[PDB]
């Protein structure tokens, strides 16, 4: 993906459910606020521990 480098605080979340690997970030949705919105979903083959 592409991302703009900034000075403001950012957050990332990673999880795995039955519909795949789920990556959440606030940059794509909320630059000056913050929330874990689904910006990526890998259709993964397996669950990673």
């Amino acid at each position: 993906y592409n991302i703009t480098e900034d000075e403001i605080l950012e957050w990332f979340g990673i999880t795995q459910t039955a519909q795949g690997v789920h990556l959440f970030s606030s940059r794509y949705v909320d630059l000056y606020g913050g929330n874990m919105f689904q910006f990526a979903t890998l259709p993964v083959y397996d669950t990673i521990k």
Binding site: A18, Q19, Y45, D46, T47
Partner: protein, 146 residues
């Protein structure tokens, strides 16, 4: 909201393992369905006027899974989850060569130790190849958009 399919080599011979409350070797060690969402299983056959899909060598599957620990006295099974693969699949190859194949791998002490061992068996092809499709539907994962 979204749909999910899986497909696999399912002949009709073990079709009696299609039930929701099934606890057979395909249910125990291979896959278990989604109990919170509707599902459907379709067993189809290769048409004569269709060469778009290929035919594999033989039906192969697993029928046993055991985590023997380094003490060589404590053994624990595994429970497969919905749309999930056990660590049983991480050691078993993509196919099983013949019936009763033993696949084993050393385990680290933090994950249990000893040797993870699994047993695989097989079912040969019929006159025409049969495919198994499993569809699961979900309402609350994304936008209603399909």
């Amino acid at each position: 909201s979204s749909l999910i399919l899986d497909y696999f080599s399912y002949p009709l011979s073990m079709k009696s393992d299609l039930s929701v409350s099934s606890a057979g070797p395909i249910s125990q060690f291979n896959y278990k369905q989604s109990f919170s969402n509707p599902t459907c299983l379709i067993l189809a056959t290769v048409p004569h006027n269709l060469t778009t899909i290929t035919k594999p060598l033989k039906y192969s599957y697993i029928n046993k899974c055991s985590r023997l620990l380094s003490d060589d006295r404590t053994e624990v099974p595994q429970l497969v989850n919905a749309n999930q693969y056990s660590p049983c699949v991480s050691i078993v190859p993509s196919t099983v060569w013949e019936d009763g194949d033993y696949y084993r791998k050393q385990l680290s002490p933090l994950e249990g130790g000893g040797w993870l061992v699994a047993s695989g068996s097989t079912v040969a092809m019929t006159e025409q190849l049969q495919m198994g499709f499993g569809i699961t539907v979900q309402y609350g994962t994304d936008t209603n958009s399909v």
